[PDB]
Structures are given as C-alpha cells and as structure tokens.
Design a protein around this ligand. Structure first.
Ligand SMILES: *O=[P@@]([O])(O[C][C]1O[C](N2[C]=NC3=C2N=[C]N=C3[N])[C]([O])[C]1[O])OP([O])(=O)OP([O])([O])=O
Ligand SMILES: *O=[P@@]([O])(O[C][C]1O[C](N2[C]=NC3=C2N=[C]N=C3[N])[C]([O])[C]1[O])OP([O])(=O)OP([O])([O])=O
Ligand SMILES: Nc1ncnc2c1ncn2[C@@H]1O[C@H](COP(=O)(O)OP(=O)(O)OP(=O)(O)O)[C@@H](O)[C@H]1O
Ligand SMILES: Nc1ncnc2c1ncn2[C@@H]1O[C@H](COP(=O)(O)OP(=O)(O)OP(=O)(O)O)[C@@H](O)[C@H]1O
Lengths: 261, 261
C-alpha cells in the first residue's frame, strides 16, 4: 500500500524517492520502499534503505508520510514489484539503475513494470502537468490521474492531442487548419466533463498534426509531470505497452506516470 | 519464404536490404520484400519497392537471388510481418524507421518483432561473427545460427560468455581468476560439439566477469555480425524478449540476429 518505490544503488532511484516522498505526503498514504534481490547482499540492501530514508527526511516538508515502510525481499525484482503493485496506488521506479551505461535508457525492472505492473507506473530520471490524450479509454485513466494530480499540486494543466498517430501526413491536400480546429473542439468537449469536477486548475489544450511523442516529450521541458496511458487507439495483439508510452517514458525530462490496469 | 525484409522510407531500412540481399544470395533462398500500411499510400509504397529493388541490384554480386519477391500489403506492419515470419528463414528489419528522432533507438515494428516474430529477427542500423552464449537453450539456437552463418561466410567466429548476469560482482573474495578458467573450460566444452561440425571456422572463446551486453555490444565494433537469443537463463513470467537481447540489438554497431521460436 501507498506509493511503492523500488530502490537500488543508482542516482535515478535516489531521485525516485524524493518524488515518491512528496507524492505520498500530498496524499495521506504510506511511502513503502522495496529493494528486491536475486551476505554482502543483505548488508548492502541495508545501506540502500538507510540512504533511501535519509532522502525522505530531506525530501518532505511538513508531515512526513503517515507511514514510511521499507522491506528488503530476497526475490526477482520484477516479480516482486509487479505483485506488490496490485495493492499500491502508484509504482515509482528510476529509469536506469546501477548497471546502466551510455546508449541505454530503460532496464529489466523499469521495462518490465511498464509492461506488467498493476498500477500506474512512474519512471523518474535525473509547474503544470502535461497530458497525452486521444480519448482511447486507456488515456481517460491518464487524464483522470493528471487532474487528480494537478489538484493536490495546486497548479495548472496542459492537455495535448495529436491528430494523427501515423507520422507524415504528407498526404494530399487535407484541410489541416480546419480539421485542426475541429479536433480542438472535440478535445475541448471531452475535457469539459473534468473542467467542472476540478475548478482552480486551468485547462490549456493543444492540438498538433503529427508525432505525439516528440511533442509530449519535448514539451515536457516546461511542465513538472507528464502523463500517458499504457495503451491507446491502435496497437497490435500481444502488446504490453504503447510504443508512444514507452518512448515518452524513456525520453522525457520530467517524471512520467503511465496509467495501467 | 526466404528472408523477408520489411521496408519503409528510412535509411536504416535501405541498408536492411543490402544485408538481406547478400544473405539470400549466400544461401539459395528467395529475397522477399514486404511493405505493410494502415491513394498516395499505394503510389508511395510503389516507389519504396522500386528503390528497394534498386538496392538489391547494387548489393548482390554473382547470382542475384533465385527469386526476388516483394509485396505491398494493406495491413498493420507488425501483424503482417509476425504472421509472414512463420514461413521465413529470417526477418530483417531496420532498427529505426521513418518517424525516428534523436533519443529513440527502436520502433513499433522492430520492437514488436523482437517480441513476437516466429523466426530469428535481424535488426540492422547504419569479418568474424560474435556470439553471446550462456548455454541457456535459447542461445544454443543462436550459436547454431552463428556457425551456420560463419560457414557460408567463409570466416572466423568469436564466442563470448560472461560469468555473471548480475552486474557487480563486487561480492566477497570469490576467486575470479580460477572461476574464470573453469568457465573457459566449460565454454570450450560446449563449443566442441560444433567445432567438429564446422572445421575451417576458428572458434575464439572469451570469458568475462560481468556485464554481458556492454561487451557483446562494444566488441561488436570488431566483428561483422552479432548473434544472441531472444531469451536466456533468468527472465521473468510474461517476458517476450531478453533485456540483454533487446539492449544489444538497439546499441550494437553491426547487424544483430536474435534467434527465436
Ligand atoms: O499509441 P500508443 O503508444 O499511445 C499510448 C498512450 O500514448 C498517448 N497517446 C497516444 N496517441 C496520442 C497520445 N497522446 C497524444 N496524441 C495522440 N495522438 C496516450 O496517452 C496513450 O495512453 O499506444 P498504442 O497506439 O496502443 O501503441 P502504438 O501506437 O505504438 O501501436
Ligand atoms: O539475459 P537475457 O537478456 O539474455 C538473452 C540472450 O542474451 C545472451 N546472453 C545472456 N546471458 C549472457 C549472454 N551472453 C553472454 N554472456 C551471458 N552471461 C544470450 O545469447 C541470450 O540468448 O535473457 P533473460 O536472462 O531471459 O532476460 P534478463 O536477463 O533481462 O532477465
Ligand atoms: N533489485 C531491485 N529492487 C528494487 N528496485 C530496483 C531493483 N533494481 C532496480 N530497481 C529500480 O528500478 C529501476 C530500474 O532499474 P534497472 O535495474 O532495471 O536498470 P539497470 O540496472 O540499468 O538495468 P539492468 O538492471 O537490467 O541491468 C531503477 O530506477 C531502480 O530504482
Ligand atoms: N509499414 C511497414 N512495412 C514494412 N516494414 C516496415 C514498416 N514500417 C517500418 N518497417 C521496417 O521496420 C523497421 C522498424 O521501423 P519503425 O517504423 O518501427 O521505426 P520508427 O518509424 O522510427 O518508429 P514508429 O514507426 O513506431 O514511429 C524499419 O527498419 C523499417 O525498415
């Protein structure tokens, strides 16, 4: 319960705590910390949680999570976490763990959770909340979380819907300016059902023609949280994560929640 | 049949042909070319295959594939390919297609095939054959392909087995030099069953302590083909591709076959 947060010897995971700390503060929920594994082992794990907690003390301001759990568990990280997610509000995990290197940008753990966790997965790296919408049901999650979030974080929001999932458009003379304004209407429509629910949060909406990732990504540089579902309109048979989710998760410069289950 | 090769408007895929051309020459098999999709559409696809063929002419030397197939198919790339793989020797696909951008290093298609294709997937980017072994059954494929390959390509090979799948080792005073020589023996053992089968191919074997990807990768700089299975010893429940496969595929500087099915 509360917001779990896998920890290891990486600076990405260090930082994963600060952001789990404050999110379990802004809601009155337990900040559980889990370090799985396969003794220097046990003794190492001890130090990790000692430092992880040392981060939590620094991180939070006024309250300090109603409970601060942590547990070293002798088991395969993924199976452990995936299972523990079932009874968790959120799954916080660094993008890259110890055993990372240059070209890489995900890992056995972060990768697997985005593909199997039973709760929105948050991958953090090292004021408004940007949201990637296509009304594709898996994002009507994501938009939910995005509002909920921007309430407790007493701020603004930014919706963003790309018209085409396939790139180029360089198709024939389709009237972009006109199909655009009508996508802007349609988007405005399905954020009205929220806009009420949540006054005090300014809904800014943006419609683009083309690539929905290189833009969510990018424009993440200007927000403090990006949110996008684990799946969407399109996608094939045994897929576990949207190609647009994963990519935004591994490339954005801001925490990226990825709604699931 | 033969060696299929998904094509699109990307230079990675351009190059994918040259390497499909010559591999379908070195064996007497058909060089089928497939461009799926969802008209400028049909007319665009036509140009792709015109150019794709123009590459095949340039690429091959002496013979020119016993058949050169190609087919534009109105369907989701992945489903199409995955299905067509079933009756194919190999699946050649560029790493990154048109609609790529900086931080990215796989795509809906290449990603999905490494996770669902029914034949060894080859991802190419833009003299010996390096092989990533752990005796984990999925690599006794890979080693098979690696030899088969280095025969027809009348050259050498290089086996490589990392002792530990988990990184650091910085565990207690385990005798590395000694566990090493005994991993070198054990590796030498299970390449003896091949060494015969395939004289004229020099089996060079390397045992390392640690990270099996940052090394397969890297040392790919010096070989002309890297080979590694779709899975291995370890890995969790509903996994579709090894974390070591994928990573070597997306970061090596040489074609990377990834045995499967
Ligand atoms: O296309 P996906 O990867 O997307 C899943 C999530 O990505 C976000 N998203 C999807 N499509 C758009 C978008 N944001 C803005 N604009 C557009 N057009 C959304 O939040 C989804 O939750 O998932 P798929 O489509 O199942 O997998 P692919 O596209 O890779 O086949
Ligand atoms: O560990 P994997 O990703 O590996 C699958 C393939 O990778 C190669 N390989 C695996 N382990 C080694 C290796 N090469 C050299 N040395 C070592 N130690 C091999 O060719 C395999 O085919 O697959 P997993 O283990 O199922 O998934 P992870 O490790 O990510 O949990
Ligand atoms: N054993 C573990 N227990 C709990 N959390 C973990 C564990 N390993 C990693 N994590 C967390 O999950 C995230 C993903 O780390 P991961 O280990 O997948 O990256 P990596 O080490 O670079 O890749 P790999 O481990 O596959 O070599 C990290 O941010 C880390 O905080
Ligand atoms: N519609 C298609 N038909 C056949 N082959 C394709 C098709 N699309 C891509 N390919 C091939 O598969 C490989 C993967 O391309 P992919 O499209 O996945 O990369 P990308 O376009 O950068 O990512 P995405 O398409 O998800 O935005 C490329 O090398 C390309 O040659």
């Amino acid at each position: 319960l509360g917001i779990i947060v896998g920890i290891d010897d990486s600076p990405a995971a260090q930082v994963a705590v600060r952001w789990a700390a404050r999110d379990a503060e802004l809601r009155k929920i337990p900040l559980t910390l889990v370090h799985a594994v396969s003794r220097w082992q046990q003794d190492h794990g001890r130090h990790l949680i000692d430092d992880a907690l040392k981060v939590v003390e620094q991180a939070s301001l006024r309250a300090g999570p109603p409970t601060v759990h942590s547990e070293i568990v002798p088991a395969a990280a993924v199976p452990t976490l995936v299972d523990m997610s079932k009874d968790a509000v959120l799954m916080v995990v660094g993008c890259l763990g110890s055993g990372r290197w240059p070209g890489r940008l995900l890992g056995s753990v972060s990768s697997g959770l985005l593909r199997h966790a039973h709760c929105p997965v948050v991958i953090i790296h090292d004021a408004p909340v940007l949201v990637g919408v296509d009304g594709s049901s898996a994002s009507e999650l994501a938009t939910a979380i995005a509002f909920d979030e921007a309430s407790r974080r007493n701020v603004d929001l930014v919706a963003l819907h790309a018209w085409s999932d396939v790139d180029v458009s360089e198709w024939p003379g389709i009237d972009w300016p006109a199909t655009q304004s009508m996508a802007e209407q349609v988007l405005a429509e399905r954020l009205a059902g929220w806009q009420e629910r949540y006054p005090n949060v300014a809904i800014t909406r943006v419609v683009v023609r083309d690539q929905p990732a290189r833009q969510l990504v990018q424009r993440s540089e200007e927000a403090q949280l990006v949110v996008v579902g684990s799946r969407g309109r399109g996608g094939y048979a045994g897929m576990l994560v949207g190609s647009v989710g994963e990519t935004v998760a591994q490339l954005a410069r801001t925490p990226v929640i990825v709604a699931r289950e």
